């Protein structure tokens, strides 16, 4: 077993993806504003 | 049995829904 296989599980990629989406939405709102 | 994905995704999903409501409030026919 090379490298941490568990670090490629479902719970790690899903949250970071969602966090990115949220940050994108707030950034979009800021850009549109003014 | 509890799952890390379920417990993490529930609060994150709440935050996402809040954001969708935030945009919807200032966007009627804009998508």
From Swiss-Prot, chain A:
Subcellular location per the Swiss-Prot or TrEMBL entry: Cell membrane; Cell surface
Transmembrane segments: 12-32
Domain notes: The WSXWS motif appears to be necessary for proper protein folding and thereby efficient intracellular transport and cell-surface receptor binding. The box 1 motif is required for JAK interaction and/or activation.
Subunit annotation: The gamma subunit is common to the IL2, IL4, IL7, IL15, IL21 and probably also the IL13 receptors. Interacts with SHB upon interleukin stimulation. Interacts with IL9.
Family statement: Belongs to the type I cytokine receptor family. Type 5 subfamily.
Function statement: Common subunit for the receptors for a variety of interleukins. Probably in association with IL15RA, involved in the stimulation of neutrophil phagocytosis by IL15.
Protein name: Cytokine receptor common subunit gamma
Gene giving rise to this polypeptide: Il2rg
Curated annotation (Swiss-Prot), chain B:
Lineage top rank: taxon: Eukaryota
Organism: Mus musculus
Protein name, as recorded: Interleukin-9 receptor
Subcellular location: Cell membrane; Secreted
Residue ranges of the TM segments: 4-24
Subunit structure: Interacts with IL9.
Family: Belongs to the type I cytokine receptor family. Type 4 subfamily.
Source lineage: Eukaryota, Metazoa, Chordata, Craniata, Vertebrata
Domain observations: The WSXWS motif appears to be necessary for proper protein folding and thereby efficient intracellular transport and cell-surface receptor binding. The box 1 motif is required for JAK interaction and/or activation.
Protein purpose: Plays an important role in the immune response against parasites by acting as a receptor of IL9.
